[PDB]
Write a protein that binds this DNA or RNA. Structure first.
Ligand code: LC2
Ligand code: K
Ligand code: K
Ligand code: K
Ligand code: MG
Ligand code: MG
Ligand code: MG
Ligand code: MG
Ligand code: MG
Ligand code: MG
Ligand code: MG
Ligand code: MG
Ligand code: MG
Ligand code: MG
Ligand code: MG
Ligand code: MG
Ligand code: MG
Ligand code: MG
Ligand code: MG
Ligand code: MG
Ligand code: MG
Ligand code: MG
Ligand code: MG
Ligand code: MG
Ligand code: MG
Ligand code: MG
Ligand code: MG
Ligand code: MG
Ligand code: MG
Ligand code: MG
Ligand code: NA
Ligand code: NA
Ligand code: NA
Ligand code: NA
Lengths: 74, 92, 59, 53
RNA sequence: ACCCCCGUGCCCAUAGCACUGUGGAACCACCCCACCCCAUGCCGAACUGGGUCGUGAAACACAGCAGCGCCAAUGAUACUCGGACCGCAGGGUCCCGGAAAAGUCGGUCAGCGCGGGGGU
RNA sequence: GCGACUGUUUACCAAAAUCACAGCACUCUGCCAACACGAACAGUGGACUAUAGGGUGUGACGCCUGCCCGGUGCCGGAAGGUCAAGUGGAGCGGUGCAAGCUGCGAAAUGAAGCCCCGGUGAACGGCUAAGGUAGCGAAAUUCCUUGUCGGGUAAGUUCCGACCUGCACGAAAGGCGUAACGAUCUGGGCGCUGUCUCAACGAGGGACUCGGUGAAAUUGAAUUGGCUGUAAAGAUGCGGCCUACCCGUAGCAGGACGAAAAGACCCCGUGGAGCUUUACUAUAGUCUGGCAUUGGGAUUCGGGUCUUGGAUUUCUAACCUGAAAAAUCACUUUCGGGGACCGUGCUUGGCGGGUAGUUUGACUGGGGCGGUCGCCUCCCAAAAUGUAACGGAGGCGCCCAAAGGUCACCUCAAGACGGUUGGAAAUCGUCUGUAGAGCGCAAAGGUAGAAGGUGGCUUGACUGCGAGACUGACACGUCGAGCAGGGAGGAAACUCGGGCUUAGUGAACCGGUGGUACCGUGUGGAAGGGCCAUCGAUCAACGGAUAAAAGUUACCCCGGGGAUAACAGGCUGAUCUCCCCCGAGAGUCCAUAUCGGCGGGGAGGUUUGGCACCUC
RNA sequence: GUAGGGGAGCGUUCAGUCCGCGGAGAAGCCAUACCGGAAGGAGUGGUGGAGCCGACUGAAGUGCGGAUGCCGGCAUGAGU
RNA sequence: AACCGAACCUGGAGAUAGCUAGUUCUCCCCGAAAUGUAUUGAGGUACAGCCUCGGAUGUUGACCAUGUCCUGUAGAGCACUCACAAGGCUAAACCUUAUGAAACUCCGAAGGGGCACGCGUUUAGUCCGGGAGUGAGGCUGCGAGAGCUAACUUCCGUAGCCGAGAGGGAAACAACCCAGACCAUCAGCUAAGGUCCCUAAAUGAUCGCUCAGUGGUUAA
RNA sequence: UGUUAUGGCGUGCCUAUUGAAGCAUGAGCCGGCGACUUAGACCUGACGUGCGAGCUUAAGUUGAAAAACGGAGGCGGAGCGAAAGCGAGUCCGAAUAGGGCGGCAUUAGUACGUCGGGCUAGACUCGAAACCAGGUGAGCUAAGCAUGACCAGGUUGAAA
RNA sequence: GAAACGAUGACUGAAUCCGCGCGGACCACCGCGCAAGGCUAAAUACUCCCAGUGACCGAUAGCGCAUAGUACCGUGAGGG
RNA sequence: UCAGGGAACUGAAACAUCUCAGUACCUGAAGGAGAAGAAAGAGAAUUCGAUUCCGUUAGUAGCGGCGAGCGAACCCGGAU
């Protein structure tokens, strides 16, 4: 039926290489696709965020478990 | 009234009691040889308002001994005038 | 309107809207935690004009 | 958030001396009587706190 | 320095399963007892307390084995960025680059650390 | 066929089957009648009176007129239930030293109605309250239908007579029949006729010509061809080609999408008006209680300490009305009657389309009908995000004192083998088993080190906050470390400010409750107002209009629109039409003299449509 | 280059001021082959018979092809 | 009192009109949009995007390269879900062979996007503030739905162009191809397309094809 | 310069639109008339000008071939909060987290004029069906009431 | 609305000196004023008429009219 | 000018309140003006001290389906 529908959103917000700040939201998702790495926390809605300052870092161990860490500069 | 105007959660309460005249402390201090503030000569010191009382607030800082006769005054004001000389007179 | 002088657009030193939060206060609530305790301030930079034109004079 | 005779209800919060509401969605479905707990109101805290209206 | 065992990481199937062999008191496991601390909505199976013999069978460790998994070229091809065309059309082609999947060759059943222990 | 008749009506397109009609029926009305005009208890009309008058329906006459009153309407009965002002006053609250001065406010009692019972149907209305008595019947009701048969005609879809399957015939919105009546409607026949096959002659007034007088609509400019194609898709000004000396008169009407009227159909406009009702709301009117005008004499019932009230009854100076003498009255009087009612004024409640002011949504391959608006999950979505349709599917408007926090412990679906009420699954045991299960619901993602399953303890489903980010035009929405006051579980690190996440909800205004004390217009209080929290929302047309709302217009008006339908053309060619391919088989034998199962490939633009391309 | 925004100017009427013109004659009208980047302006001639250019500045009742615009005059349909 | 589903005249009144039409002198500069969201909103308005003007900032803009990270379209594939061809075995499962998928994914491009920097060439962006217009586009190529894989069809994404765009070419013919008009000129070279004649320009050169007027309307 | 012959080229204007020569709209011609203004010490912005931490007056009075006087008042100056109030600080809060404001290395205004634009009035101009008040009409027409008038002639032949 | 006060129709109905009304229900305090009788220059509005004036028109302007509520239209109001 | 009586269109992007507005219209009465006027006031200073008009207060307080939108007074200057 034509009726029903939803704007939705989701995706990634801070990509790798980028310089985050204490509170920047990294990736939004529904499940646990991107697990909270080092330097990165996780919200109720699996929304990843940053604790302090640093740089975005992606890590992939052959799919399944994604990780995102933050390497400080200083 | 259908564009932001309305739909704003505000009731508040209008009172409008007494609005005192802000007399900056640098106006007394710094310049001047003390013209004696009183309640009439002060009109020539650029504080002409009328209808409302007078308030004395500390903002300018240059210790100097001057006498002040305003209607009301702050905690920090009184503890800044007599601290360098003078006396803050308030109505009985 | 005089319901504007008592509307959350106070004439600040700069000249913008002193908003609040219309999420939920009186009715239709009872869920969440401190969602209602959001009785803070609000500000906008696209309606300050078409709002101050009704209260600016009687600041 | 409908509100009729149906099961479950929105509850006011009282306290031993304390005068504070917690607002909680209960339910008369199962054990429906011991709506007592412990929500410290602005105060010393640790006050006997039953939402039971 | 040699080797082995135990504990714990990096790595997280090219380091996994199966089959087979080796290991016996340094280590590991089984095992023995367990009224009480503790515990399995029933069982001290598993947790757990106190400890000989025996055995290595099982488990575990190691080694061979790679039948099976896993990993996976070269070449070509599909597709496509760009440019340029054809058919009434569903479509399709040329030039220039990038470039799969699968399959095949082939690859290998790890490697790299720290600490402790007992042997030469 | 209809209507009985005479008559009558849409001045100016409908004279008819309309209306009227004598007749019949129901029903109201006791005469200052009912009713009606009216700002007015004035006045008048009814009308100078019960087979009289008002309203309604049917519409001479004849035979006749059934069944169902559940509902609605009305009449009657009326125990009880509810119901306004008022009567009454407990309690509660405020101020003051007090006397006292003041807010809020009952039990009971309290009119007309409503609910409730019955009845009334020539009341609406039906044929669940019951269901077609007579008669008529494809008849003006007829759909399928040109029905079937018969009559008339050489031939009849209409017409007449019957039958019957009466889409929706039906007895006073009358059924059926009927003499007479008819510028009415329908069919047939006779007569006659240029009505017709078929045109001819003749005439008279105009068209034609000359002299005189001399308009109108219209008009971008004109030096203004035909064929084809193109162009907004209908070409004299574009292209190509063909034709065509210049200029009139008399004539024909194909073209200039010819002239007149911004379209009367249709759609749109939060345009208008008229008209309806069980749309909203109010009012004329009207019913009614109390209180004035409004008194006297008794009885009972209420009570307090002479009376104060309700009702009943009765008399009368108010008042109303009639007669006589100076008809309308003012006057005095004999009186007559009614007479504390009525009328009228204020107030309360009900009734109320008579009247009045208005609402009645949008999207939409025209509109209407149907369907559908918010939020959530996939696909479309073309590897950031985003992205539409009346595109393809499936959910939500909750649930849970635990499915919460935390702390510990357990690991699945299924198959095979073997076992007892089993005999498919399941209960048990042992192996295999990246889980092919589970996670409260829809779906996706994700999860084996758990967001799978259990137990103990608890109420962080806390309060005061929040650097910095995601997302939106705004408004909202989403995530969140850390800090503080106090707690929970664990030895502890540590975690917890609801539940694997994404739906389980909605602004403002207004009001209710608790709390706290800011304001409080002379002062001090108080009423009230603010603030904190929180409650009321199929407001689902779900960013929401109003506290409060339906239809019709073919009697229609206006402002617009080829921005939006029906005609036509144009585009397309499902459908339609035609042609062609292969060939099983029929054609005694034999595929193709003819015919062409299944299925395929094109053409045409004559069908029904799609779309909405130029003209409203 | 449309809606639109910005900039520089022309022309007309009235007003203040300045230099002036006019009976051998203004304005207005009429002809024109000149000038300026446009809006426009100038010379000369004819007409006409009283007033009116240029410069600066100020103020609007300020610039026409259209609205089935309005008023007036005059055409076409025709010698129909 | 010649036109009545509510007379005429005057007045409120210059009623309102999201409607329609019209909207007057000149040159110069820049230069739109028909999208998103909301609306008793749909042919109207608010805000945003998009325009111009001023100030500030003054290269953060643009294109491209390099590095890094992310996203599952095309393709493919059968390893889950559904469907599906033949055979073996004894209907399901399992085995051999063979498939199809917008709502399957063992795999997985091109390309795209964010960020950093510039190794390089160019040029603008942002912020504040005044005034706007536009919130009814169309087609073509490509990638999709809807439709009969029809429509000068509808609805989205994307590029260009038309819109406000002259000129040349395609006979004519906005949308196609080639090209963006400061002006003047009896000047030259070129693009798209052509070079017998009607219009400018080799009835050109070399090797073939078609006896057809194919070119100059289609297929089994 | 005027006029013409011929060749080449060449789809009125305006409006409304995705698209006009349009077989879409408007227009006989010409002259004249005709459409973004005006007011409110209003609000806001650009520019210009005279004061400058100050900045001006309104009514009015006295004078006018001319102008001054007039400082009731308004805008500057301190913000923040619902308010009391406090104050360079205040609201949430039982003291430290933030929002708003000063201080920022640093930024003053006000009055008047012209102009863009907003507000409030008919607000660019022209235009509708309609609603309301008052008044005029039955000398047309639909009827009533009062009083006058008119209907050749012929035919059919009821009661009594 | 917590809704005073003034006013009025209908019903009721006080005091007056240790008095009465009012001061945004109410009360105390406090404060102001004392009705149920009347009359009364000037400042103010407008303008038929008159004078004067004009960055007011110069007749398709300006009042409608360079005189006319006349011609003309309607039964009339009225339009013009 | 006062008094009696008293609309609608419109606005509220519809529409019952409110606006429009107590405006238009109707009617009564009077003048060269009326109205109003000598405190049972305003108001917050133990104050000013008939009325009316102008300026200001100020678009403030307040009112309002708390919408549209409507909208004082005191203090003070001035006419008198
Ligand atoms: C059935 C139809 O086919 C139909 O109803 N057609 C419409 C014209 C009609 C009804 C005319 C009726 C006559 O009483 C007058 C005739 C008219 C006014 C003719 C008008 C004509 O010139 C323009 C169009 O008018 C239409 O709206 C119309 C859609 C139409 O097809 C015409 C082409
Ligand atoms: K003649
Ligand atoms: K046509
Ligand atoms: K001359
Ligand atoms: Mg809105
Ligand atoms: Mg026969
Ligand atoms: Mg007759
Ligand atoms: Mg003849
Ligand atoms: Mg031609
Ligand atoms: Mg003819
Ligand atoms: Mg029209
Ligand atoms: Mg119309
Ligand atoms: Mg994408
Ligand atoms: Mg409201
Ligand atoms: Mg009619
Ligand atoms: Mg069109
Ligand atoms: Mg058609
Ligand atoms: Mg002739
Ligand atoms: Mg008439
Ligand atoms: Mg008008
Ligand atoms: Mg330009
Ligand atoms: Mg649009
Ligand atoms: Mg589009
Ligand atoms: Mg356009
Ligand atoms: Mg042209
Ligand atoms: Mg033409
Ligand atoms: Mg035309
Ligand atoms: Mg049109
Ligand atoms: Mg006779
Ligand atoms: Mg008047
Ligand atoms: Na003749
Ligand atoms: Na009505
Ligand atoms: Na009006
Ligand atoms: Na009068």
């Amino acid at each position: 039926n034509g009726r029903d529908s939803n704007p939705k959103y989701l995706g990634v917000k801070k990509f790798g290489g980028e310089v985050v700040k204490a509170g920047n939201i990294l990736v939004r998702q529904r499940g646990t696709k991107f697990k909270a790495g080092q330097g990165v926390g996780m919200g109720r809605d699996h929304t990843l965020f940053a604790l302090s300052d640093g740089k975005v870092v992606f890590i992939n161990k052959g799919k399944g478990a994604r990780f995102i860490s933050i390497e400080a500069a200083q | 009234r259908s564009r932001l105007i309305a739909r704003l959660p505000k009731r508040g309460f209008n009172n409008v009691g007494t609005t005192y005249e802000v007399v900056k402390l640098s106006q007394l201090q710094d310049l001047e040889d003390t013209t004696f503030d009183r309640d009439t000569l002060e009109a020539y010191r650029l504080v002409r308002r009328k209808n409302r009382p007078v308030k004395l607030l500390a903002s300018g800082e240059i210790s100097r001994a001057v006498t002040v006769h305003v209607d009301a005054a702050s905690a920090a004001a009184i503890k800044a005038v007599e601290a360098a000389g003078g006396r803050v007179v308030l109505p009985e | 309107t005089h319901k504007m002088a008592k509307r959350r657009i106070k004439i600040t030193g700069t000249g913008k809207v002193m908003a609040f939060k219309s999420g939920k206060r009186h009715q239709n609530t009872g869920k969440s935690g401190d969602e209602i305790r959001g009785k803070g301030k609000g500000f906008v930079l696209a309606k300050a004009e078409w709002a101050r034109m009704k209260l600016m004079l009687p600041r | 958030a409908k509100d009729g005779p149906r099961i479950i209800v929105k509850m006011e919060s009282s306290a031993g001396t304390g005068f504070y509401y917690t607002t909680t969605k209960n339910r008369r479905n199962t054990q429906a009587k011991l709506e007592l707990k412990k929500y410290d109101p602005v105060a010393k805290k640790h006050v006997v706190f039953r939402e039971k209206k």
